[PDB]
Design an enzyme around this catalytic site. Structure first.
Site, PDB file in Angstrom:
ATOM      1  N   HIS A   1      -9.002  -7.374   0.136  1.00 11.80           N
ATOM      2  CA  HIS A   1      -7.819  -6.656   0.660  1.00 11.80           C
ATOM      3  C   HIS A   1      -7.946  -5.162   0.361  1.00 11.80           C
ATOM      4  CE1 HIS A   1      -3.791  -6.362   2.400  1.00 11.80           C
ATOM      5  NE2 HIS A   1      -3.734  -5.267   1.567  1.00 11.80           N
TER       6      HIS A   1
ATOM      7  N   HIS B   1      -2.860  -1.584   7.507  1.00 14.34           N
ATOM      8  CA  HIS B   1      -3.431  -2.859   8.042  1.00 14.34           C
ATOM      9  C   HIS B   1      -3.728  -2.786   9.564  1.00 14.34           C
ATOM     10  CE1 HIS B   1      -1.200  -4.890   4.460  1.00 14.34           C
ATOM     11  NE2 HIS B   1      -2.195  -4.113   4.076  1.00 14.34           N
TER      12      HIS B   1
ATOM     13  N   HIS C   1      -4.338   3.751  -2.286  1.00 13.90           N
ATOM     14  CA  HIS C   1      -3.963   4.601  -1.121  1.00 13.90           C
ATOM     15  C   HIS C   1      -3.919   6.067  -1.548  1.00 13.90           C
ATOM     16  CE1 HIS C   1      -3.515   1.206   1.499  1.00 13.90           C
ATOM     17  NE2 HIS C   1      -2.758   0.589   0.559  1.00 13.90           N
TER      18      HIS C   1
ATOM     19  N   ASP D   1      -7.794  -2.244   3.101  1.00 16.39           N
ATOM     20  CA  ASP D   1      -6.898  -1.071   2.923  1.00 16.39           C
ATOM     21  C   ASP D   1      -7.717   0.208   3.109  1.00 16.39           C
ATOM     22  OD1 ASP D   1      -4.432  -2.467   2.508  1.00 16.39           O
ATOM     23  OD2 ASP D   1      -4.667  -2.322   0.292  1.00 16.39           O
TER      24      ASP D   1
HETATM   25  N1  FZ0 Z   1      -1.758  -2.257   1.287  1.00 15.13           N
HETATM   26  C1  FZ0 Z   1      -0.589  -2.593   0.415  1.00 15.13           C
HETATM   27  C2  FZ0 Z   1      -0.062  -3.967   0.795  1.00 15.13           C
HETATM   28  O1  FZ0 Z   1      -0.760  -4.741   1.481  1.00 15.13           O
HETATM   29  N2  FZ0 Z   1       1.170  -4.247   0.302  1.00 15.13           N
HETATM   30  C3  FZ0 Z   1       1.885  -5.396   0.537  1.00 15.13           C
HETATM   31  C4  FZ0 Z   1       1.507  -6.397   1.419  1.00 15.13           C
HETATM   32  C5  FZ0 Z   1       2.289  -7.541   1.576  1.00 15.13           C
HETATM   33  C6  FZ0 Z   1       3.484  -7.690   0.873  1.00 15.13           C
HETATM   34  C7  FZ0 Z   1       3.870  -6.684   0.009  1.00 15.13           C
HETATM   35  O2  FZ0 Z   1       5.048  -6.723  -0.650  1.00 15.13           O
HETATM   36  C8  FZ0 Z   1       5.226  -7.674  -1.685  1.00 15.13           C
HETATM   37  F1  FZ0 Z   1       5.329  -8.877  -1.205  1.00 15.13           F
HETATM   38  F2  FZ0 Z   1       4.168  -7.764  -2.428  1.00 15.13           F
HETATM   39  F3  FZ0 Z   1       6.316  -7.264  -2.307  1.00 15.13           F
HETATM   40  C9  FZ0 Z   1       3.109  -5.529  -0.153  1.00 15.13           C
HETATM   41 ZN    ZN Z   2      -2.710  -3.660   2.095  1.00 17.09          ZN
END
Ligand code: FZ0
Ligand code: ZN
EC number: 3.5.1.108
Length: 286
Positions: free
Chosen positions: A235, A76, A262, A239
């Site tokens: 999103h 991010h 990813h 990414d």
């Molecule tokens: N690029 C991957 C990404 O953005 N993952 C992500 C973002 C926010 C919260 C999260 O953790 C959860 F809340 F979903 F567990 C995982």
């Molecule tokens: Zn992400």
């Protein structure tokens, strides 16, 4: 000449680690020409530097590694650097992960815009895609195609009912579409199934409705936190911009993602790097 850019001022932010759920101190600093983005662990003695480069990548996220030292969740902040054209910066961290902030590139956009942009007296280098390069993993595909500009497309047909039995698709051409306006604030979907399993193991302790769109077996729990139409695919584009920036320069070309993530993104970077007749480094005199 189109010039390299760095930050005008040092900025200090704090947030919480997605995995630790504990406070992490984030410092962004100007850096010299041809540095790239370089992450450093200032909690370690001596301080350990890891350049944000494809060959430093070691799951559901992008992790940089140098020996036994790691930096998790870089995608991010790198998306924000790519989308604002920051060539050169130091990223200091008090812990092994970038803070999750609101789960988008938005907070990093805000920090960078607040620090200001500084032009440097060196030509900006671009990586130009000269021929098609693709990778595949079962039904997943990721492709680079020659294109006079920068364009990122993503499609996924995912079999969870939140998606209404429809393929989700989006295309962003950055000559017409604003990264800041149309991509930067997109959050991902977090499935309760997966989060509950991680939290039971003392993992993903920082994850919540504050940094993800939480979805149960059937549907989005808080539609009030939705920011965009087709936010899940926006999103995935956020990414991919962050993953592509691990090439070390702005891309002149088109990325096409088909249920990619990813892992397949990084395999596409390594395939491109190996196919040396498929890309060239170019500069411009306006
Ligand atoms: N690029 C991957 C990404 O953005 N993952 C992500 C973002 C926010 C919260 C999260 O953790 C959860 F809340 F979903 F567990 C995982
Ligand atoms: Zn992400």
């Amino acid at each position: 000449m189109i010039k390299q850019r760095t930050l005008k001022n040092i900025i200090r932010a704090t947030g919480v680690g997605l995995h630790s759920g504990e406070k992490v101190y984030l410092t962004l600093k100007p850096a010299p020409v041809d540095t790239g983005i370089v992450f450093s662990r200032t909690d370690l003695d001596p301080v350990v530097e890891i350049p944000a480069r494809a060959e430093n990548v070691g799951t559901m996220s992008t992790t940089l590694v140098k020996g036994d030292v790691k930096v998790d969740t870089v995608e991010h902040l790198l998306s924000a650097m790519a989308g604002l054209g920051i060539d050169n910066a130091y990223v200091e961290l008090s812990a092994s992960e970038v803070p999750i902030m609101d789960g988008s590139a938005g907070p990093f956009v805000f920090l960078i815009q607040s620090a200001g942009l500084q032009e440097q007296e060196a030509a900006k280098k671009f990586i130009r895609i000269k021929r098609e390069v693709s990778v595949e993993e079962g039904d997943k595909r990721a492709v680079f195609v020659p294109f006079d500009g920068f364009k990122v497309s993503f499609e996924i047909d995912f079999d969870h009912p939140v998606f209404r039995g429809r393929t989700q698709q989006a295309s962003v051409d950055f000559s017409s579409t604003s990264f800041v306006k149309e991509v930067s604030r997109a959050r991902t979907f977090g499935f309760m199934r997966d989060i509950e399993y991680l939290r039971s193991q003392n993992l993903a302790l920082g994850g919540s409705v504050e940094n993800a769109i939480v979805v149960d077996e059937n549907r989005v729990l808080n539609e009030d936190g939705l920011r965009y139409e087709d936010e899940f695919v926006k999103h995935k584009i956020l990414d991919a911009i962050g993953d592509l920036y691990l090439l070390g320069n702005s891309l002149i070309g088109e990325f096409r993602g088909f249920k990619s993530g990813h892992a397949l993104n990084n395999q596409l970077l390594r395939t491109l790097i190996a196919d040396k007749d498929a890309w060239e480094v170019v500069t411009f005199e306006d």
